[PDB]
Structures are given as structure tokens and as C-alpha cells.
Amino acid sequence: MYDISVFIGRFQPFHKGHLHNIIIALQNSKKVIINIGSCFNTPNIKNPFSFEQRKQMIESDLQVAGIDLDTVVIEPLADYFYQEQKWQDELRKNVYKHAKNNNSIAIVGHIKDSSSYYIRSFPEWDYIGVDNYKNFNATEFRQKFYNGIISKQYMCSNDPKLGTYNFLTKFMDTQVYQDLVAENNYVIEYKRLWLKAPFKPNFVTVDALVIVNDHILMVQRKAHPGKDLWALPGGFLECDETIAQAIIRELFEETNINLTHEQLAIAKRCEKVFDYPDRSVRGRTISHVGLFVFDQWPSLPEINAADDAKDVKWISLGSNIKNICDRMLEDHYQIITILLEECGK
Amino acid sequence: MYDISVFIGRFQPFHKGHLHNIIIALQNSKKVIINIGSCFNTPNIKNPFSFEQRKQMIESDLQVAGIDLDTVVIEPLADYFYQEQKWQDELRKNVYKHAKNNNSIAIVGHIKDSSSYYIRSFPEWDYIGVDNYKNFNATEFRQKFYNGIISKQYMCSNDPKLGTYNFLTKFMDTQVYQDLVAENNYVIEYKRLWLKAPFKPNFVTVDALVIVNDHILMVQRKAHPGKDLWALPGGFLECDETIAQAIIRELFEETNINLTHEQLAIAKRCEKVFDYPDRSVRGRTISHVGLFVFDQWPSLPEINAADDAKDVKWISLGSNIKNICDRMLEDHYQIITILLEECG
Ligand SMILES: [Cl-]
Ligand SMILES: [Cl-]
Ligand SMILES: [Cl-]
Ligand SMILES: [Mg+2]
Ligand SMILES: [Mg+2]
Ligand SMILES: [Mg+2]
Ligand SMILES: [Mg+2]
Ligand SMILES: [Mg+2]
Ligand SMILES: [Mg+2]
């Protein structure tokens, strides 16, 4: 009846529940646009699979199901935890890439949660609730998967040679899988330490974004989480320092930048708080990030990695940053984007 | 030697250590200017005594020393944890009041971590460093004090009818003393829970500064710390909400303010972070405070105190706020001043 339905999910991984909702969508529309959220990020335990991997998984399960792939299109969405309007527009762009001169368009979202959000943000499309009487727990799936087990009742395919089932079987023979398991164990041990604390803690960290001649200073991580990923230099706030002091302390600690306090104090543009509750796999971590801008500087200050940085580099803006946009810790690509727009550049 | 020596301290309480520094100062100079830090706040466990009480104690201890009091001058300083220039301007105000006929001026520094700050902040003046005798610990003294014990070695006077000894002896019979002991026991028991855990945890709180028709919304506190003090509505950030969400949640839980979420979102001017390490006695607590301004409204919205607020009130800017400046929780008077100045 509608020309286009719009379906949004993370699909980490795709499972029977996602499938049911796509079946409902197609009983109500001729074509379903599948938008995959949280694309263009490096693998982490919550988001182990890339856009292309998830897209391939979905296609293989829809064929198992077997839904005609001409009735299905798949598009990526980046994370915009702090810029909802960019996400809203990015979704629109995905749809109108496929929608034609006054196609009817409906979002086949969720009668329970998030419905309110889509209704308000997309008044111009209709809404179809589906929800959602079977509890397909994405976290529970991954936890067993990190323990070597693929939960069959989630899998569209019952044959390990096919579908997402097949993808996951092969994926367990990879180095990335081994890295995910290592990160996961790190996270389990970390959380265990905090079990008999009277309250769940909100952790506080700091980062420094240092721009010198359109080059960003980035460290390559030694430790979990985000082992081997690139990140802004930063770390935990200690109990006896101000945030402003911490930002500078961690910067020197990890990069040994050849600049003085006063030079950085002159260069400081702003601090911003990043508080999206799921930004970090460790627990609830809030980051305060200072922007420091140096223009027409005589050269790039000397730097060398130490403490929890195993490498450190100046990285020119434009192509070299965009290039590692999916090799960055947590939400740092978003943080860099926002500070350069709001306080930069 | 110097016309003028400058002495800065908390003096919670004045002790033997302070007395000798001033004596050294009185041979190295003609007149001492004593600047008492952290004045104009409510009593709390780290700052149990007011300006007037500390001054009194100082004077009476000095007569028992038995130092001339034309030699000695005492002035207050407020806290400005987030505006150090203001702090420096009031110190300079204090000194300039007593020293403007080109006098020689030196700062005599009896605190060790503050020495560098003073050297950097006041180069117009000389700095005389005094590494004191034994360790007269203010915290230890206060803790023994909240356990019924005056440490006799700290005291200047040996007679409980003279000096700060007399003052403190008498103070133990007061309601303020009981309030502090009660605040102290809460904190000790609070910290007890919290060593249960891998790392010293920074706490994260939120507050809301809501102004309507030039009135600020304030809560009187049901619970420790700062029981019965006036405060911005606020409390602990929950793990599953954003800061902006939490600010509004605590505001509604504590005041039941009759405005919608959307009205508050439209009124919202900014959000600032206050992160002075010793702002709260509980442990290290960073607060994010949202400012909400309704330049005008038909009336002051209905408010009803709930949860950890025992009363709630619209208090008008200017004199009504200034008259409770020393009945506010922690750094809230500073927070209010800053948000109005810069956000604003
Ligand atoms: Cl997980
Ligand atoms: Cl760190
Ligand atoms: Cl609370
Ligand atoms: Mg670090
Ligand atoms: Mg570090
Ligand atoms: Mg660190
Ligand atoms: Mg509260
Ligand atoms: Mg509360
Ligand atoms: Mg609360």
C-alpha cells in the first residue's frame, strides 16, 4: 500500500526479530529501505560488525527467508549522539535517494520506545508500529558469541553454512574476533571491580584536541578499550585537580608535547562536555574536551608517545583524518567534528 | 625591616603555629595584616567558625601573647574558587586599605602549597617563607574536636577561661556544634561505603538555576550535607540519562515546579561545570548547572517541596539573596553569581 517503508536498526547482528519486523513492513509497503545505524566506527564489543558486513549478513538472511531482494534496499547511518539534526537529515537523504515523485512513505518503527521520536522528527511520513513481543536481547547474544556460542534461536538460518549463521561461524576464526574477546574480558573484569560500590559510578575523563597548522594530535592506544585505535590524548580526572589542569596533565603525559602551559592557555578556545550514556563500553563515562588552536605556527611541536599512548602523530585535517574516521576510539570522530565547527578551526 | 606583613589563613581554628608566624612577622615588620579566608559561608565541618568568631578568637589569643593590638589588623576574604582575579583584587583591597603611603609590603607564607601561588599572584610584594615547627594539622584537630576533644598543644591559652580555648570550650555546648558533629558522622559513614571500590570516585551532580520575574528558585535541604541550608534544586546524575535530562529531573522531583519540560527547554540559557576539588565535604563532586530564565511570567509558578527538599521558595534577586548568602550550600552563592554574570 505505501510505496516505501523505512526501517532503522543496528543489526549487531541481524536476527529473527529484525526479520519479523521486515516481514511486517513488506506486508504494508512495496519496498523497504533498511537503514543501518552506527556505521563507520571501528569494531567494539557493542558494534563488532562493519556496515558492509551487516549489509551482507542481512542480504544472506533475507534470501534464506526468502524475501525478494528487489524489494529491499540498504543504507548506512553514522552516529550523531550530539547532533540529532545531522542524523535526521542523513536519514532523509537515504530515503529520498530511493523515494520518487510523491511516493507514500512510512516509518515502520516501534509501538513501544522511540516511536515518539520519529513521529516528532518526521511528521511528513506516516508511522507503523510493529512491536515486538519476543525479547531478542542483542547484548545477551554477543556475550555468548564472545564465549564461542552462536545462539541458534536468533539465527534466521538453521544451517551453519548459510546466512548470518555462516558469517558468524567464519568470523570466529578471525583476529578481529580474538580482539573483540580480549576487549570483552577487559570490560567484564572492569565492571566486576565496581560491583559492591554503593552506587553505579559516572566516570569522568578529559581529552585535549590540539590543532597546530591544520594537524590534529592523536595518540594510538596501548590499552583497552579501543586497543590499537587512534584517539585524542586524554584520561581519567584525578580527585585533586581541576578539569582544566587534568586536560593539560594528560596531554603532556601521553604526548610529551614541546609546548608550555602559557602557550596552551593562550591557544585554548573552549571546553565541551560529552555525556552520551553509551559512549563508552567500560561504564558511564563523561568527557570534558578542551580545544587548543595554533595557526601559522613555526613548525609542528615535538611529541613522543608515553604511558597509555604507544604511538603519537600529527594528522593533517581533510583526507588523512577522514581516512581514519573508522579507526578512532568511541565518539572521538564526533567530538573532533563538533569542536572544529563550534569553537574552531 | 618591612612596614607591613601580609598574613592569609583559614584559622579553623587559630593555633600555636599561627601565633609564632605572626611573632616572626612582627620582628620582620611593623604591622601585620591578617586576611581570614572563606568568610561569609555557613558553618560546615571544614569551616566551623564565622569571620566574627575567628577574629574574636585571634584578638583574644593575641592579648594572651601578649602582643599589642595596634600592631595587628584583621580583614575578611570570601571564596572565589572560579574567579581567582576577584580573590586577588579583594586581598589587594584589604592590603591597600592599610598600606598606601609607600610602605614596604611582604607576604609571610606559612602554608606550603599556597607559596607559589602567592609568589606568582603578588610580585608587587616580597614573600617570606616560614617552614613551621611541628605539624599542627587543622583536619586532625577538628576531627578530635568533633569527638569531644580540644587538643591542648594547639591552643595558645592554657586557661579555658581565656583565648580560643575558652571560645571552643563554650562552643561545644551550642546547637551549631551538634549540627557539625552530626554532619561529620554522616560524612565518615558516607566515606565508609565508598572505600568499597577500586578508585577514588569523582561524583557527578546537576543543579538548576531557574529565574522568573527576577526571583531565583531555591530549595532548603532536608539531608546532609548542608542540612537546612538553601540550595539550587539538584542532585546526583543517573547512569542512564544525559546531564540535560538530569537537571530537569531533579528540578521536578525537588520543587514540583509548575512548568512543562518544553517551557524549560525554551528558557534554557546555558549549562556550566563547577569542579573546585574541595567544594563538597562528601568527596570530590563536580556539578553541571543549567540556567533557565523567564524574563517575565504572569505569576511565580507553583512550587511544592518533595524528596530531599524540605522547603522551596522563590527568592528575589538583590537584597533577599544577599541576606541568605551565608546560609547556602557549598559554593552555590558563587554559582549563582557566575551564571548571572556570564549567561547571564
Ligand atoms: Cl555486548
Ligand atoms: Cl589514562
Ligand atoms: Cl539528590
Ligand atoms: Mg589516557
Ligand atoms: Mg593517560
Ligand atoms: Mg591517566
Ligand atoms: Mg538533591
Ligand atoms: Mg534530589
Ligand atoms: Mg537524586
Residue A45: DSSP 8-state: S
The residue written with cell numbers 569527638 in the block is B147
- For residue B10, how many other CB atoms are within 10 A of its CB? 17
Helices H, strands E: what count in chain A?
A: 11, 12
| Chain B partners within 8 Å of A276 (Cβ) | 242
Closest CA to A248 of A219, A209, A284: A209
HSE, side-chain direction, 13 A CA sphere, residue A118: 21
Question: Which of these, B157, B154, B152, B155, lies nearest to B63 by C-alpha position?
Answer: B157
For residue A316, what is the enclosing H or E element? strand A309-316
Give me the residues of A, 276-315, that contact B with CB < 8 A.
276-277, 283-284, 286, 288
Query: Cell numbers of B90, please?
Result: 579583594
SS (H, E, C) B251-303: HHHHHCCCCCHHHHHHHEEEEEEECCCCCCCCCCEEEEEEEEEECCCCCCCCC
Provide DSSP, A58-120. Answer: HHHHHHHTTPPGGGEEEEEEE--TT-HHHHHHHHHHHHHTT--TT--EEE---TTTTHHHHHH
CA closest to B285 among chain A residues: A239
Q: Which domains does chain B have, with CATH numbers?
A: 1-196 (3.40.50.620), 197-344 (3.90.79.10)
| A35 and A6 Cβ atoms separated by less than 8 Å | yes
d(CA A270, CA A295): 16
How many Cβ atoms sit within 10 Å of the Cβ of residue B268?
17
Please tell me whether residue A209 adopts helix, strand or coil conformation: strand
Contacts 24+ apart (CB under 8 A), B97-104: B98/B4, B98/B31, B98/B33, B98/B73, B99/B3, B99/B4, B99/B33, B103/B2, B103/B3, B103/B4, B104/B1, B104/B2, B104/B3, B104/B4, B104/B29
d(CA B240, CA B40): 37
Rounded Cα distance, B11 and B24, in Å: 17
In eight-state DSSP terms, residue B42 is -
Helices (H) and strands (E) in chain B, counts: 11, 12
Whether the CB of A262 is below 8 Å from some CB of chain B: the reply is no
**Phi, psi (rounded to 5 degrees) for A206:** -135, 155
Tell me which residue has cell 608566624.
B21
> Across-strand partners of B168?
none
Cell numbers for A221:
592506544
- Contact by Cβ (8 Å): A339, A291: yes
Distance (Å, rounded) from C-alpha B292 to C-alpha A331? 29
The whole-angstrom distance between A271's CA and the closest CA on chain B is: 10
Sort out which chain B residues have CB atoms less than 8 A from A273's CB and list them: 243, 271, 273, 288
Residues 6+ apart with CB under 8 A from B281: B44, B45, B46, B183, B187, B225
> Does A298 sit behind a cis peptide bond, omega within 30 degrees of 0 on the bond before it?
no
Closest Cα in chain B to A275: B242
Q: Are B243 and B288 in contact (CB under 8 A)?
A: yes
Using an 8 Å CB-CB cutoff, list chain A residues near B275: 242-243
User: How do the residues of chain B divide into helix, strand and coil, expressed in percent and rounded to 5?
Assistant: 35, 25, 40
CA B274 from centre of chain: 14
CA distance A249 to A243: 10
The resolution, in Å, is 2.3
- Gap between the Cα atoms of A51 and A47, Å rounded: 10
How far, in Å, CA of B200 to CA of A148, rounded? 36
State the CB neighbour count (10 A cutoff) for residue B197.
16
Sheet holding A29-39, edge to edge: A72-78, A29-39, A2-9, A105-107, A126-127
Phi-psi group of B257: left, alpha or beta (phi > 0 → left; psi -120 to 50 → alpha; rest → beta): beta
Q: Is B232 in contact with B272 (CB distance < 8 Å)?
A: no
d(CA A219, CA A231): 5
Asked if A219 contacts A309 with a C-beta cutoff of 8 angstroms, the reply is yes
Interface test with B, best of A199, A202, A203 (most B CBs within 10 A): A202
- B117 lies within 8 A of chain A by CB: no
Give me ligand 2 centre to Cα B201, in Å.
15
Collect residues with CB below 5 Å from ion ligand 4.
A 235, 308
Cβ contact B59:B32 at 8 Å = no
Grid coordinates in use for A295?
595557526
